[PDB]
Design a protein around this ligand. Structure first.
Ligand SMILES: [Fe+3]
Ligand SMILES: [Fe+3]
Ligand SMILES: [Fe+3]
Ligand SMILES: [Fe+3]
Lengths: 139, 139
């Protein structure tokens, strides 16, 4: 059985997305506990978040055989990782965030539209900086 | 204009998932660069990952108006955050990971199936620990 094209590949991608979101959510929850003074709860959310990091890393290790869950491109070496990062960032600043900004404007969410435009600009900066790093990579 | 039910709500949920995965991916790429000896590349992946943390944070702040992207439940206070964490974890250990392990075993991925069962047990641990924290919460 080959993993590529299987239902298990799809489950690995979905589980990777869920573990990734769980780490971000739990760190957000930790910050809210911090401000409240619930320092024991904050520490618990932070420790659980590290568990989700280990889970996500494991899912990615299996995905190395089929490709980056964000781009479909190969990953592993620093050259491949930079190539995939550039591809994904380029999609985000040429397509994803500008399109979301337009929709938010159209629906009347002007501040959220401005947020999406800020992020389009930020991802363009990330893409350009990775491209410079790839140009200088000695491997 | 109300965010709930809009295309912009869906876009924020999708962007939150993507930024969360970008941080996890970039930290994975940094760990590969670490081992290779590409320390400048590793530092760049880690710095960019902190950018993605800021983006995911901001997406979550807008989603507070409509609910946790993983559960639909309200979030903000420690009591709300713990209830949402418990709900998400309970689904992972009762439904998601056991179902993924079965599909993996059927398709002949025995190691991946065992991985999914390890994570079902881990998420049950997380769920029970959050339940005990919520029972002791003094707010
Ligand atoms: Fe997990
Ligand atoms: Fe970026
Ligand atoms: Fe970002
Ligand atoms: Fe968990």
């Amino acid at each position: 059985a080959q993993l590529k094209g299987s239902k298990t590949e799809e489950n690995l991608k979905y589980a990777f997305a869920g573990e990734s979101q769980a780490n971000r959510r739990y760190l957000y929850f930790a910050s809210k506990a911090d401000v409240e003074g619930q320092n024991d709860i904050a520490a618990l959310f932070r420790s659980t978040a590290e568990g989700e990091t280990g889970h996500a890393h494991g899912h990615l290790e299996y995905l190395e055989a089929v490709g980056d869950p964000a781009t479909g491109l190969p990953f592993g070496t620093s050259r491949q990782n930079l190539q995939s990062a550039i591809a994904g960032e380029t999609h985000e600043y040429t397509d994803m965030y500008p399109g979301m900004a337009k929709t938010a404007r159209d629906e009347g969410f002007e501040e959220i539209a401005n947020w999406f435009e800020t992020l389009a600009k930020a991802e363009r900066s990330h893409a350009n900086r990775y491209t410079k790093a790839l140009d200088g990579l000695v491997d």
